[PDB]
């Protein structure tokens, strides 16, 4: 509770609110960019590496098909995503550089993070050592302290959404489920292995779901697999709600203790959601070696620098069928996306 942290977060919230209340809109257009490669694809959108034709800068352009967003009931989520991203500012949050829309699609032009997904690195090495997991975890703790102070819940923590930058630090990406919430919210969203019990059980839930997800992430980083793994979602959900977790014997006692407090089924007893808030996590013995300010200032040497050749190198991302970016002659779903 150092006044220094209080004053930092008060300024952070002031700056967020000014942008939140007057969002930027329509700051580029599609023909300002060349398409390079598809980096990922989903049921209503895609991410493509693009290059700005005048500056030469590379970006990750997320393209969402308006009709599919509507069909999959993602309108509000998409509006949340863009309004939040244009208003936030933190060292471990990916930057939204431009946004715009056309007759068919919504576009969010993000910084490109060439090291690829944490998930790929984790799966290639098997598991991270505790110091390595702790370095990433510390960045997530600080990022959640920031987001939660702004009344934002992230709701999609998982290794695929954490990209590794040129200095070996995290960039949190994919704000598709992020939401500004005072009090409780109810939507079923997230990824199965990372869902808190109160989401599975259809309760009104709060920021404590992000702290649960951090427990899942730390476990998965340190073990190589998530704590509630099973072959089918229903089996995963049964394990999540059960109140039981098994730890590998290689985990330190401090790690097990922290994880029991993050993976606490009773949200009213979960670290990050008690009277001392984030400080119960920051002051835990597992984080005793963490210099929180040095992490924030990016002065700690990272566990590894991803291997890549330059800002246009796509070698840490995988290969997808290349599909057209078609723009209809007629405006689709204009009313739904007026504010974008
Ligand atoms: O926020 C996102 O969804 C996002 C996805 C991918 C990348 N990227 O590939 O750098 C950046 C942001």
UniProtKB/Swiss-Prot annotation:
Would you tell me the protein name for this molecule? cAMP-dependent protein kinase catalytic subunit alpha
Residues where Phosphothreonine occurs? 38, 185, 187
What is the annotated role of this protein in its UniProt record?
Answer: Phosphorylates a large number of substrates in the cytoplasm and the nucleus. Phosphorylates CDC25B, ABL1, NFKB1, CLDN3, PSMC5/RPT6, PJA2, RYR2, RORA, SOX9 and VASP. Regulates the abundance of compartmentalized pools of its regulatory subunits through phosphorylation of PJA2 which binds and ubiquitinates these subunits, leading to their subsequent proteolysis. RORA is activated by phosphorylation. Required for glucose-mediated adipogenic differentiation increase and osteogenic differentiation inhibition from osteoblasts. Involved in chondrogenesis by mediating phosphorylation of SOX9.
By sequence similarity, the record places it as follows:
Belongs to the protein kinase superfamily. AGC Ser/Thr protein kinase family. cAMP subfamily.
Q: Which Pfam families match?
A: Pkinase
PTMs per UniProt: Autophosphorylated. Phosphorylation is enhanced by vitamin K(2). Phosphorylated on threonine and serine residues. Phosphorylation on Thr-187 is required for full activity. Phosphorylated at Tyr-320 by activated receptor tyrosine kinases EGFR and PDGFR; this increases catalytic efficiency.
| Domain AGC-kinase C-terminal stretches | 288-340
Q: Which residues bind ATP?
A: 39-47, 62, 111-117, 158-161
Q: Supply one GO molecular-function term.
A: magnesium ion binding
Q: What are the GO cellular component annotations?
A: acrosomal vesicle; axoneme; cAMP-dependent protein kinase complex; centrosome; ciliary base; cytoplasm; cytosol; glutamatergic synapse
Native species of this protein?
Cricetulus griseus (Chinese hamster)
- Which InterPro entries has this protein been placed in? AGC-kinase_C (IPR000961), Kinase-like_dom_sf (IPR011009), Prot_kinase_dom (IPR000719), Protein_kinase_ATP_BS (IPR017441), Ser/Thr_kinase_AS (IPR008271), STKc_PKA (IPR044109)
Q: What is the tissue localization of expression for this protein?
A: Ubiquitously expressed in mammalian tissues.
Q: Which reaction does it catalyse?
A: L-seryl-[protein] + ATP = O-phospho-L-seryl-[protein] + ADP + H(+); L-threonyl-[protein] + ATP = O-phospho-L-threonyl-[protein] + ADP + H(+)
Q: What is the lineage of its organism?
A: Eukaryota, Metazoa, Chordata, Craniata, Vertebrata
Q: Where is the signal peptide?
A: none
Query: What GO terms in the biological process aspect are recorded for it?
Result: adenylate cyclase-activating G protein-coupled receptor signaling pathway; adenylate cyclase-inhibiting G protein-coupled receptor signaling pathway; cellular response to cold; cellular response to glucagon stimulus; cellular response to glucose stimulus; cellular response to heat; cellular response to parathyroid hormone stimulus; intracellular potassium ion homeostasis
